[PDB]
A paper describes a structure:
Proteins attached to the surface of group A and group B streptococcal human pathogens that contain tandemly arrayed Rib domains have been associated with invasive infections and proposed as potential vaccine candidates. Here, we study Rib domains from Rib, R28, and from a [name] from [name]. Together, these 5 structures of homologous Rib domains, and further sequence analyses, show Rib is an example of domain atrophy, a rare event in domain structural evolution involving the loss of core secondary structure elements, and also reveal the remarkable structural malleability of this domain family. The structure, molecular dynamics simulations, and small angle X-ray scattering of a Rib domain pair suggest tandemly arrayed domains are likely to form an elongated rod on the bacterial cell surface, thus suggesting a possible mechanism of immune evasion mediated through domain number variation.
We hypothesized that some members of the Rib domain that have long insertions in the position of the characteristic Rib D-E strand atrophy may retain the full Ig fold and thus represent something akin to the ancestral form of the atrophied Rib domain. Thus, we solved the structure of “Rib Long” (RibL) (residues 1165 to 1268) and “Rib Standard” (RibS) (residues 1269 to 1329) at resolutions of 1.07 Å and 1.25 Å, respectively. As predicted, the Ig-fold D/E strands missing from RibR and R28N are also missing from RibS but are present in the RibL structure. Thus, RibL comprises a full Ig-like fold which likely represents the ancestral state of the Rib domain, and RibS is an example of evolutionarily recent domain atrophy from RibL; this is remarkable because there are very few cases where we have the structure of both atrophied and nonatrophied domains that are closely related in sequence. RibS belongs to the “Rib” subfamily, giving a Cα rmsd value of 0.6 Å for superposition with both RibR and RibR28N, versus a Cα rmsd of 2.3 Å for RibL. A longer Rib domain contains the full Ig fold and likely represents an ancestral preatrophy structure, thus providing a rare example of a closely related pair of structures of an atrophied domain with its ancestral form. In the atrophy of the Ig-like RibL, a significant loss of the structure (∼20% compared to RibR/RibS) is involved, but the domains remain thermostable with melting temperatures (Tms) of 78 °C and 88 °C for RibL and RibS, respectively, and 71 °C for RibR. As Rib (RibR, R28N, and RibS), RibL, and aRib form 3 distinct Rib subfamilies, this begins to shed light on the evolutionary pathway of a fold where an ancestral Ig-like fold (RibL) has lost core secondary structures (RibR) and diversified in structure (aRib).
Author numbering: 1163 to 1268
The structure:
């Protein structure tokens, strides 16, 4: 079998909308080359882009995203990246859209 594990997986994160002082958690979903749900391979590792906000964290083993903007964080949108490394050393860059909403009043 030729190719890379990355060719057979398509991790995805739902959009995040979070107010200052909230904590939201997002589990990546995943589909195969045919578009059908599939589990991410065990041993896959996850790392946020080092330029991502300090208040976005990515579980290194599971890829779960914890988004916890402090009080005082400005409202606004962010387009961030998570690097996925499969156990064969292949990689994917996976985006997440993170909106910080106003604390009280949209």
């Amino acid at each position: 079998a030729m190719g890379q594990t990355a060719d057979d997986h398509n991790p995805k994160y739902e959009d995040v909308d979070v107010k200052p002082g909230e904590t939201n958690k997002v589990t990546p979903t995943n589909t195969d080359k045919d578009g059908n749900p599939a589990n991410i391979p065990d041993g896959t590792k996850f790392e946020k882009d080092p330029d991502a906000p300090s208040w976005v964290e990515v579980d290194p083993n599971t890829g779960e995203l914890t988004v916890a903007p402090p009080e005082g964080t400005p409202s606004g949108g962010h387009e961030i990246k998570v690097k996925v490394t499969y156990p064969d050393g292949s990689t994917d860059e996976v985006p997440v859209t993170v909106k910080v909403s106003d604390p009280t009043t949209p």
